[PDB]
Amino acid sequence: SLSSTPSALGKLQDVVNQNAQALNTLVKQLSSNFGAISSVLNDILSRLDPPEAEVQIDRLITGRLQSLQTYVTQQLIRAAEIRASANLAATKMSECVLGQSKRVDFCGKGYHLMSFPQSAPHGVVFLHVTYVPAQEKNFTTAPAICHDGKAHFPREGVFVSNGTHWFVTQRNFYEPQIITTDNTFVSGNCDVVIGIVNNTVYDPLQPELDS
Amino acid sequence: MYICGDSTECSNLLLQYGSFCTQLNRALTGIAVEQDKNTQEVFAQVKQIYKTPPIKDFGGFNFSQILPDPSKPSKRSPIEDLLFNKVTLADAGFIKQYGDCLGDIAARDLICAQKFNGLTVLPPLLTDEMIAQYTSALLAGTICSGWTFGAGPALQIPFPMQMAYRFNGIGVTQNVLYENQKLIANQFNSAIGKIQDSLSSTPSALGKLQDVVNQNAQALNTLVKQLSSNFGAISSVLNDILSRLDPPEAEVQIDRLITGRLQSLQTYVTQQLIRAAEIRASANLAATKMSECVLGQSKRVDFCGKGYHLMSFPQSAPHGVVFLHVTYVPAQEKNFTTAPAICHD
Amino acid sequence: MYICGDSTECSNLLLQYGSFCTQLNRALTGIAVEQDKNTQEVFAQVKQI
Amino acid sequence: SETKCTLKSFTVEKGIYQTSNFRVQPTESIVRFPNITNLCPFGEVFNATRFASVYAWNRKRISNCVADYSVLYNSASFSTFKCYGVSPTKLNDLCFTNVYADSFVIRGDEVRQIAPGQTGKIADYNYKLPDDFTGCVIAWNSNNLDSNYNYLYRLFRKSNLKPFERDISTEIYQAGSTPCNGVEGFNCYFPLQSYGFQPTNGVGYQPYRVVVLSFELLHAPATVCGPKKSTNLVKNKCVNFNFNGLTGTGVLTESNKKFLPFQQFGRDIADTTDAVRDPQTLEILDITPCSFGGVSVITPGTNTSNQVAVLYQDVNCTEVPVAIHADQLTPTWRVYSTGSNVFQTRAGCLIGAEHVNNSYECDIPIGAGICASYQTSQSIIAYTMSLGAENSCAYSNNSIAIPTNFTISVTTEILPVSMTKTSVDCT
Ligand SMILES: *[C@@H]1O[C@H](CO)[C@@H](O[C@@H]2O[C@H](CO)[C@@H](O[C@@H]3O[C@H](CO)[C@@H](O)[C@H](O)[C@@H]3O)[C@H](O)[C@H]2NC(C)=O)[C@H](O)[C@H]1NC(C)=O
Ligand SMILES: *[C@@H]1O[C@H](CO)[C@@H](O[C@@H]2O[C@H](CO)[C@@H](O[C@@H]3O[C@H](CO)[C@@H](O)[C@H](O)[C@@H]3O)[C@H](O)[C@H]2NC(C)=O)[C@H](O)[C@H]1NC(C)=O
Ligand SMILES: *[C@@H]1O[C@H](CO)[C@@H](O[C@@H]2O[C@H](CO)[C@@H](O)[C@H](O)[C@H]2NC(C)=O)[C@H](O)[C@H]1NC(C)=O
Ligand SMILES: *[C@@H]1O[C@H](CO)[C@@H](O[C@@H]2O[C@H](CO)[C@@H](O)[C@H](O)[C@H]2NC(C)=O)[C@H](O)[C@H]1NC(C)=O
Ligand SMILES: *[C@@H]1O[C@H](CO)[C@@H](O[C@@H]2O[C@H](CO)[C@@H](O)[C@H](O)[C@H]2NC(C)=O)[C@H](O)[C@H]1NC(C)=O
Ligand SMILES: *[C@@H]1O[C@H](CO)[C@@H](O[C@@H]2O[C@H](CO)[C@@H](O)[C@H](O)[C@H]2NC(C)=O)[C@H](O)[C@H]1NC(C)=O
Ligand SMILES: *[C@@H]1O[C@H](CO)[C@@H](O[C@@H]2O[C@H](CO)[C@@H](O)[C@H](O)[C@H]2NC(C)=O)[C@H](O)[C@H]1NC(C)=O
Ligand SMILES: *[C@@H]1O[C@H](CO)[C@@H](O)[C@H](O)[C@H]1NC(C)=O
């Protein structure tokens, strides 16, 4: 993916291109008259006596000082931008390479698992290993299940139904489980919840008590 | 055109100053491209356009004040439509581009190119309709799926169940919602109504966006008003210096005018670069808030509202975004006697 | 006062340049206001004392 | 080629490029002037026998007449013709208001004194010009024509003379601590002192005759114009207008400006005249400068193809040839001013790119939701950018969707960290 795509490291090459363009413009601004008789100090000095050469030399000085000031100001602005990007990169390295971040889309499209740093010219490349769900399936769901006079809510999961029986799974992976008392908790009766369905919550102690 | 408008004698002198206009144009072009990239980064997070929910029964939650209104020329929600009337260009000095800056209005005009002194306002790449469509897609994906549409394929879930998930997110069990569902829905609807009323009543509600416009018009009115300064020359008009003085004693006043106008342009470009950096920081923050709060539930404190974050809803506004942060706030405390542990046998 | 310190002639000569003195004052005032905004943002988080 | 010259490169990459204006803008001129037809009284300023002395220089207000300054400008009878704030060649076409003509006589060494901002004896006590002065000073030698103690001056003035003022009082100047009793003593002298001009005394003391002409401007509609010919005004074309001395380049177009009768010029916020009242016919013609300059070319890259599209910023597709002055352009430029591929976007008129009804991702951002792309035979196509794929998850209460599988995906985030450390030796 990195090799086939031509402009993969576009933002890393833009730094080099911008620096080169700025330096080339600064060099080329040394060939401008700025109003003087010539853009070469030696030509001004070798043709004019000092009282009249001072005017042209002052014009050249003003123009070149303006060019240098423009270069320094744009470099300060660009350095502020690069500092912001480097602070973001340092935060990303701290929170994603040295840990696991719960922030959404901070370190990739999907649930973050890990990240790997790779140095690159004038920057860093993070490879974000993430978890993406796939192969969804539609089930019938219920907020709670009404046992004999009691309302049962899933402890850590969700109630689904494959058409006739009811299971409790985890919300990020279809792992149906038999709805038992260790899977759910009771929070009242079957009157307040809107959408509560009738089912049976198996108790993993009655078979032991029978025998 | 700003420095030496349609004057060849002035253009030849301006050529002696090197590539300064080229640098100014490059900087302004970079600023404009960055301005487009800011909107693209904030709103074009997910590029799956989810249709506005047709089934308008979400267990009590209303959502009508934030979903698009079909009975409007533009598919803008009532809150969005109310937000678009609070940012005005009436006080902006460069409001004069109201001369139908899309193809002229009366005979030929040629405004926003050669009617002013070279200053133009390019149109944004993403129209307000496209930004509204992006916002509506985000809202529909949040309602139908929750946080699942920003981390993979969208997975449908009933809204009360998603609110139970988001209640579990902040450390409150599911039954707390499944029992007071009606109370929570009524509180949510009342809060949205209060938000609409407060936006409609307070005049300076959108002070952060307006203060941006007032900062970009004032920067432009200074640019035109500096064309009336002679900067030490005999006049502030090149057409009068050229029509009165001969070339050899006119190129000393034209040089002064050129230097002054170049200095004014450089000042404008520098201040605009700094302002663009500030706006880029704000746009990065807005993109982060859209990623971590519209597309998920954030545990960061005070990042997305005062309280325990439940969810958030985006609404496009002129040159910005308004997040409605729905949060859970404890209330009606009660004193109890507590112990670290309980000593059984 | 910085450029033309107490001089009517210099002040009149400075008027030839445009809003080159109001612009600097506006920028400095904006910075000064932003400093107070920063201080309020960092510390005045919870208004209850 | 305009784009290649704007970037100073022979290879142009894909995208939109705003292009600088390299085209032939200027065209013919008009000299529309008022209807005044009478010669000014300039004859009795230079051919008069009587000339009041420098201490009592005589001033005449010339107004509401034409005056060929070339007849004075070509005569060889003058020696110094020093014009300040104006050029003698351009004095012809320029129409001034309320011309003033002062005349006097001085000596040879005193001619240099007649100049703005200069300290002397007559320049400080008899006739002082303003520090800034728009006009001319014409001094000519008249040695064997006026020499005789008639001419006098004010040797002893109190402090100095305010510019453009006269003082012919004969009161005795006080030149000491002793109060001046009234008669000239040791501390009192007569300011009115005369030097007898001699026919043979030396070049320095040879009499000279001096006339100062001051043409004040920016003082309501001007009257004293030159020997110009009122040409027929031409609208809807680039011109070089000279409306009562209001020189400028641009296009004159009939306007709807109210222009109350006393108002004559009209101006915009930048204090630039964007309208005029024609002196012949009281019609308002707003001035729109030529040299469009608002042009951006769309290039698929010179590596791919030499085809280009052209976007004119806010022009209307019908008015594209009227703007950019396509009549004066080269035939290769004229192909992009009109054709069968004109398309009016909210960002302007796009010529050379065919509009398609499909929607793809934005390749070259044109603006206002419109993008362009080089697609296949091959040509540049302009479309409306597609926001994204159109899906829909069917919301259904009591129904959930659960993933039965996963995917491990490795993304890639590039972040610049540092830039080149550079140093510049300022000296
Ligand atoms: C979601 O909330 C909105 C309001 O935020 C509800 O719309 C409101 O519906 C009521 C009852 O129909 C409207 O009151 C009456 O409507 C018509 C207007 O012609 C008329 O009979 C009366 O003058 C009165 O106003 C109310 O106007 C309307 N509000 C708005 C802003 O349109 C909506 O019903 C709720 N959705 C539900 C309950 O599913
Ligand atoms: C003051 O009086 C003198 C008197 O000499 C005027 O100078 C004369 O001006 C006339 C009209 O411009 C000149 O006539 C011209 O002469 C030649 C003939 O070859 C030609 O250029 C024209 O066809 C025209 O006839 C005349 O030569 C000239 N005389 C001298 C001795 O220079 C002067 O114009 C009067 N006015 C002022 C303001 O000085
Ligand atoms: C839903 O799942 C249940 C539990 O896995 C299925 O019921 C079982 O079906 C298998 C295969 O026929 C039998 O061996 C088991 O005895 C069944 N269990 C019970 C408790 O009856 C059921 O068939 C599934 N339903 C659908 C529609 O797929
Ligand atoms: C779940 O089972 C309960 C058992 O109590 C059902 O409640 C009974 O419903 C019938 C029919 O409406 C009423 O006549 C009884 O009076 C109800 N009994 C009680 C104790 O409330 C309930 O309807 C069942 N749910 C479903 C969906 O069948
Ligand atoms: C939410 O689910 C409930 C489950 O009861 C739906 O209510 C039933 O809908 C069916 C199908 O139209 C009707 O035959 C029943 O009479 C409804 N029952 C009751 C008690 O009203 C409800 O329609 C679902 N919501 C939506 C918007 O479809
Ligand atoms: C819980 O007890 C605290 C004291 O431990 C109560 O705080 C009192 O609040 C009242 C009303 O503001 C004040 O007049 C008292 O001075 C407070 N006492 C102290 C020691 O600060 C608090 O109100 C109680 N909370 C509830 C909900 O009853
Ligand atoms: C109730 O708390 C008391 C006080 O800590 C405990 O009393 C101690 O009991 C043990 C065992 O009988 C004695 O040896 C200690 O002397 C008692 N302490 C005191 C201070 O009298 C008692 O064990 C606790 N009971 C329970 C059930 O936890
Ligand atoms: C059911 O799941 C399928 C994919 O398994 C999907 O196409 C469909 O939209 C889902 N929803 C409904 C209501 O059938």
Ligand SMILES: *[C@@H]1O[C@H](CO)[C@@H](O)[C@H](O)[C@H]1NC(C)=O
């Ligand atoms: C000036 O004369 C021309 C004809 O030479 C005439 O058309 C015009 O109306 C006149 N202007 C005035 C103000 O009378």
Ligand SMILES: *[C@@H]1O[C@H](CO)[C@@H](O)[C@H](O)[C@H]1NC(C)=O
């Ligand atoms: C300007 O464009 C509009 C459509 O935007 C068109 O109706 C109108 O005719 C154009 N103007 C002229 C003068 O042709």
Ligand SMILES: *[C@@H]1O[C@H](CO)[C@@H](O)[C@H](O)[C@H]1NC(C)=O
């Ligand atoms: C393209 O769409 C326009 C409306 O935008 C329609 O008038 C025209 O017929 C369409 N052309 C084709 C070839 O489908």
